[PDB]
Design an enzyme around this catalytic site. Sequence first.
Site, PDB file in Angstrom:
ATOM      1  N   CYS A   1      -5.566  40.647  19.586  1.00  0.00           N
ATOM      2  CA  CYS A   1      -6.597  40.016  19.146  1.00  0.00           C
ATOM      3  C   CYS A   1      -6.685  40.119  17.647  1.00  0.00           C
ATOM      4  O   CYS A   1      -6.830  41.209  16.987  1.00  0.00           O
ATOM      5  CB  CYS A   1      -8.031  40.564  19.696  1.00  0.00           C
ATOM      6  SG  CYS A   1      -9.370  39.541  19.090  1.00  0.00           S
TER       7      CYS A   1
ATOM      8  N   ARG B   1     -10.668  40.949  15.501  1.00  0.00           N
ATOM      9  CA  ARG B   1     -11.164  42.159  15.558  1.00  0.00           C
ATOM     10  C   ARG B   1     -12.060  42.843  14.356  1.00  0.00           C
ATOM     11  O   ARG B   1     -12.803  43.729  14.588  1.00  0.00           O
ATOM     12  CB  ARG B   1     -10.060  43.316  15.771  1.00  0.00           C
ATOM     13  CG  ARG B   1      -9.878  43.341  17.371  1.00  0.00           C
ATOM     14  CD  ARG B   1      -8.839  44.195  17.699  1.00  0.00           C
ATOM     15  NE  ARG B   1      -7.468  43.832  17.348  1.00  0.00           N
ATOM     16  CZ  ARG B   1      -6.372  44.902  17.319  1.00  0.00           C
ATOM     17  NH1 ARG B   1      -6.601  45.879  17.404  1.00  0.00           N
ATOM     18  NH2 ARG B   1      -5.208  44.144  16.745  1.00  0.00           N
TER      19      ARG B   1
ATOM     20  N   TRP C   1     -15.328  32.964  19.212  1.00  0.00           N
ATOM     21  CA  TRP C   1     -15.292  31.631  18.872  1.00  0.00           C
ATOM     22  C   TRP C   1     -13.790  31.342  18.573  1.00  0.00           C
ATOM     23  O   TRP C   1     -12.927  32.347  18.734  1.00  0.00           O
ATOM     24  CB  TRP C   1     -16.030  31.311  17.730  1.00  0.00           C
ATOM     25  CG  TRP C   1     -15.891  32.422  16.391  1.00  0.00           C
ATOM     26  CD1 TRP C   1     -14.881  32.294  15.679  1.00  0.00           C
ATOM     27  CD2 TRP C   1     -16.633  33.498  15.896  1.00  0.00           C
ATOM     28  NE1 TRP C   1     -14.979  33.179  14.618  1.00  0.00           N
ATOM     29  CE2 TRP C   1     -16.280  33.943  14.849  1.00  0.00           C
ATOM     30  CE3 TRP C   1     -18.037  33.889  16.495  1.00  0.00           C
ATOM     31  CZ2 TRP C   1     -16.631  35.035  14.325  1.00  0.00           C
ATOM     32  CZ3 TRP C   1     -18.504  35.009  15.919  1.00  0.00           C
ATOM     33  CH2 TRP C   1     -17.760  35.693  14.865  1.00  0.00           C
TER      34      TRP C   1
HETATM   35  C1  HEM Z   1     -15.002  36.512  17.525  1.00  0.00           C
HETATM   36  C2  HEM Z   1     -13.933  35.650  17.342  1.00  0.00           C
HETATM   37  C3  HEM Z   1     -12.630  35.924  17.998  1.00  0.00           C
HETATM   38  C4  HEM Z   1     -11.437  35.422  17.621  1.00  0.00           C
HETATM   39  C5  HEM Z   1     -11.562  34.248  16.313  1.00  0.00           C
HETATM   40  C6  HEM Z   1     -10.470  36.099  18.375  1.00  0.00           C
HETATM   41  C7  HEM Z   1      -9.214  35.423  18.406  1.00  0.00           C
HETATM   42  C8  HEM Z   1      -8.147  35.731  19.075  1.00  0.00           C
HETATM   43  C9  HEM Z   1      -6.987  35.169  19.261  1.00  0.00           C
HETATM   44  C10 HEM Z   1      -6.362  34.006  18.242  1.00  0.00           C
HETATM   45  C11 HEM Z   1      -6.370  35.584  20.201  1.00  0.00           C
HETATM   46  C12 HEM Z   1      -4.793  34.920  21.039  1.00  0.00           C
HETATM   47  C13 HEM Z   1      -5.037  34.120  22.134  1.00  0.00           C
HETATM   48  C14 HEM Z   1      -3.745  33.556  22.723  1.00  0.00           C
HETATM   49  O1  HEM Z   1      -2.578  33.636  21.912  1.00  0.00           O
HETATM   50  O2  HEM Z   1      -3.809  33.301  23.875  1.00  0.00           O
HETATM   51  C15 HEM Z   1      -7.324  36.577  21.083  1.00  0.00           C
HETATM   52  C16 HEM Z   1      -7.111  37.439  21.869  1.00  0.00           C
HETATM   53  C17 HEM Z   1      -7.677  38.229  22.580  1.00  0.00           C
HETATM   54  N1  HEM Z   1      -8.987  38.558  22.299  1.00  0.00           N
HETATM   55 FE1  HEM Z   1      -9.818  37.933  20.345  1.00  0.00          FE
HETATM   56  N2  HEM Z   1     -10.907  36.794  19.316  1.00  0.00           N
HETATM   57  C18 HEM Z   1     -12.368  36.734  19.013  1.00  0.00           C
HETATM   58  C19 HEM Z   1     -13.231  37.517  19.937  1.00  0.00           C
HETATM   59  C20 HEM Z   1     -13.073  38.259  20.933  1.00  0.00           C
HETATM   60  C21 HEM Z   1     -13.658  38.962  21.928  1.00  0.00           C
HETATM   61  C22 HEM Z   1     -15.431  38.941  21.678  1.00  0.00           C
HETATM   62  C23 HEM Z   1     -13.091  39.819  22.688  1.00  0.00           C
HETATM   63  C24 HEM Z   1     -13.752  40.652  23.481  1.00  0.00           C
HETATM   64  C25 HEM Z   1     -14.827  41.375  23.484  1.00  0.00           C
HETATM   65  C26 HEM Z   1     -11.831  39.466  22.456  1.00  0.00           C
HETATM   66  C27 HEM Z   1     -10.778  40.095  23.035  1.00  0.00           C
HETATM   67  C28 HEM Z   1      -9.311  39.667  23.141  1.00  0.00           C
HETATM   68  C29 HEM Z   1      -8.588  39.968  23.949  1.00  0.00           C
HETATM   69  C30 HEM Z   1      -8.321  40.971  25.062  1.00  0.00           C
HETATM   70  C31 HEM Z   1      -7.471  39.329  23.627  1.00  0.00           C
HETATM   71  C32 HEM Z   1      -6.151  38.947  24.603  1.00  0.00           C
HETATM   72  C33 HEM Z   1      -6.139  38.198  25.982  1.00  0.00           C
HETATM   73  C34 HEM Z   1      -4.766  38.068  26.624  1.00  0.00           C
HETATM   74  O3  HEM Z   1      -3.982  38.962  26.442  1.00  0.00           O
HETATM   75  O4  HEM Z   1      -4.753  36.868  26.943  1.00  0.00           O
HETATM   76  N3  HEM Z   1     -11.676  38.411  21.360  1.00  0.00           N
HETATM   77  N4  HEM Z   1      -8.476  36.890  20.190  1.00  0.00           N
END
Ligand code: HEM
Lengths: 416, 414
Positions: free
Chosen positions: A120, A123, A292
């Site tokens: 992510c 973070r 988002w």
């Molecule tokens: C606030 C806005 C957020 C942005 C801009 C963001 C952005 C991202 C991006 C770009 C990815 C990779 C997506 C992909 O390539 O498939 C990602 C993965 C991830 N994010 Fe974040 N994130 C946000 C919020 C969150 C929240 C609120 C959580 C959990 C409480 C979170 C948990 C994770 C996890 C666990 C992954 C990996 C999921 C997977 O392995 O498919 N994210 N995030």
Amino acid sequence: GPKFPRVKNWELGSITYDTLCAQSQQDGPCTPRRCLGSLVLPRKLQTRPSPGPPPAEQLLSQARDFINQYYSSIKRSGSQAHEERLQEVEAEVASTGTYHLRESELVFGAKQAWRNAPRCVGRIQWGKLQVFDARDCSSAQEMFTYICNHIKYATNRGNLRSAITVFPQRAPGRGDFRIWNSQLVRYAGYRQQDGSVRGDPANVEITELCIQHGWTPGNGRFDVLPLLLQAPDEAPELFVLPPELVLEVPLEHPTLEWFAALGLRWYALPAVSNMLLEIGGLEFSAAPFSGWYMSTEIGTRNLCDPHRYNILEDVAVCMDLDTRTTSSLWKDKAAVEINLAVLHSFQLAKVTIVDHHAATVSFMKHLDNEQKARGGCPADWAWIVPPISGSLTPVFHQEMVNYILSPAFRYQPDPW
Amino acid sequence: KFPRVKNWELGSITYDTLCAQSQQDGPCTPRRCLGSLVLPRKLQTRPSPGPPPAEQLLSQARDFINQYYSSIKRSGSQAHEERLQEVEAEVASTGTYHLRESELVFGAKQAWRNAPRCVGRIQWGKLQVFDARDCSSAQEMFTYICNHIKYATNRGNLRSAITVFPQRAPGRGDFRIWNSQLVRYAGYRQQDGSVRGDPANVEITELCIQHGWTPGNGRFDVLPLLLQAPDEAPELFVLPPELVLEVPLEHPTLEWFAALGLRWYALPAVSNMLLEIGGLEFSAAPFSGWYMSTEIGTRNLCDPHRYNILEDVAVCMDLDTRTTSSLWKDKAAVEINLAVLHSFQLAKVTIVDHHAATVSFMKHLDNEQKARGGCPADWAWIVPPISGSLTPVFHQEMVNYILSPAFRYQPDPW
Ligand code: HEM
Ligand code: HEM
Ligand SMILES: [Zn+2]
């Protein structure tokens, strides 16, 4: 020097050492013989459905570690309350084989799971997460109610707010609470007679599952799918999300007036619903979370992957580019304009979104904050660096150390 | 045991069995992955003042000799047996041994084939190998290097090549080329820390000056070579201008691009890496191929710590550099890469774009899966610096590991 991984940023020439990795208690897929860092789903974390009760001795160790983490976070490690909580957990597992978290422990754990997510890039926002406690949920119908409230709160008419809703944890011999769909909002993928696909190819299986369960399919390219919700030991139930609750953004381009005619669009809320939230050995099989979008997710991956909407050629043709040769960089030019359209459109519709430049700069700040706060930050380079303009962002030039920390979000097997 | 490797675009799966032949350890462990780190913390190449353990060297030598005879379909032959005896005899009596030219040629090609960070390996079988082991002075190194450059450049029709200087020997200094590449632009630190030229070459530029070079004052002054014979101070050699082919950069439609006065050399030739074959180490073995356009257009010209021309190009394009969301950086980068391709094509100098290169690499992966059961590949280096997911390699899982013969990093000679 220090007996920890030395991490360098090649842009600034600065160095740091990761000592946080010393706290990892779960092995990854790599070994001195070979690196498997690029594998999407390496048979490691994989929370394969473990029916029979989990070894009380193993769960106990995980529970104690988490309780220690919690009391450390509130600066009361070693206190009477700390040891008493440890005693309570040990006693509850002793007589029941499992245990339950206090409200504040769940909030802390959910935020830590996000903080610990190596893939992510968003973070820096980890401390701001609305945690909806739905551990009292007792039916699929009630799951839908909780989900609809989550969507309304998180969407907030365009000013998105990160949130997670936690349903009851797993229990031995008893079925799991599960959301069959991978995301709360997904576009249908309809297999065609010629073998092609109308809609989103990533959702062919879930689309067919919805039909098999009584859903009457549409025939569009952006048909929002219904949710298949499953309560313990029951077949999944189908629920159609009220249209007014699913905010979408029609795509248009700032200067290319014809782009809007393409009839493209995407939904505002990214909400992963098929992952497992693990806290102190306890497993929350149904705990959808949302934030988002970073624009490249929509403009580059969702719309341009060859196995997704694959619109590169259509847009390049509209731009009158030479698609007969690679050296014209037609794919590169089209992708840039598609990504710009996504940003422009979300901004016009006043829906929260972050571009890959802003997001990566913020992630670099997060790394600095974390170096001071915990001595490192687990990060998966391949997932952190954006799908377009990689080296134009700061994270590309930053070496990263990847490891598993708990609390954590993990992949789990499909329920069917 | 054997990793399952999946391609997410096509859904195809393969199993890497080749990784089992790896005898050298990487930087990763089950606790944490360090795959994104550029240089090794320990996997370096420590000094050679003493002879390597005979048993270790012997096992590496035999393995290599075995590789060689298998390649010519003569394994178990009389020649194979007798060659193994020769190696055994030389090591036991002297602590080291020597390769035959035919084996060196095979070894060099295999080292390229095994390089995990190279996306151009479909070309691995076409490598001109120059045997320079009969070199005894820096002056002779210069002559060999000039001949290498002439052959490789070929008036713009670039040809891959490698020149192998004498192997390292116990207690004796190494033959070394101080420069990281045969062609490098000077980087002059000025008054307020800024840099004129290539910031990546500040240290080498200063070393040249300190050794007698009369520095210029431009942004693209080709540096002289500092060549070092065993236990001698390095010697300075100026490459004859007519030997260094360069390409003036212009844009197909943006008339003003040429005004930027940008350019780049045609020949990419790495000269500071070590070639290891059967336990033997060649501290000076410069190799060259041809450029993939993103190396110049994206990294060399747009990296923040390199020429960093993104904003200048953006302003000339009158883009909105007021905010990141206008994607001005992305737009400028694409045009810069287009200018590189256009210019090299115009000058009739070999170059490959990132799309064509990655498609050929996918073919290479398939070829290798059939031939050896796998292919070591470093995802972070194979995926291009721009438009990553627009290329096929982005969606391809890869397994990284060290196979020998190999090209490896080594300590700087100063
Ligand atoms: C606030 C806005 C957020 C942005 C801009 C963001 C952005 C991202 C991006 C770009 C990815 C990779 C997506 C992909 O390539 O498939 C990602 C993965 C991830 N994010 Fe974040 N994130 C946000 C919020 C969150 C929240 C609120 C959580 C959990 C409480 C979170 C948990 C994770 C996890 C666990 C992954 C990996 C999921 C997977 O392995 O498919 N994210 N995030
Ligand atoms: C024929 C055309 C070739 C092309 C298009 C090509 C392209 C590339 C590219 C793009 C890189 C990464 C550069 C970077 O990001 O720093 C690379 C690395 C590498 N290539 Fe190739 N290559 C070619 C020929 C060769 C040859 C002839 C050899 C050896 C005989 C070779 C050995 C390697 C090695 C060892 C690396 C890694 C160097 C390092 O770690 O810095 N390549 N190549
Ligand atoms: Zn690794």
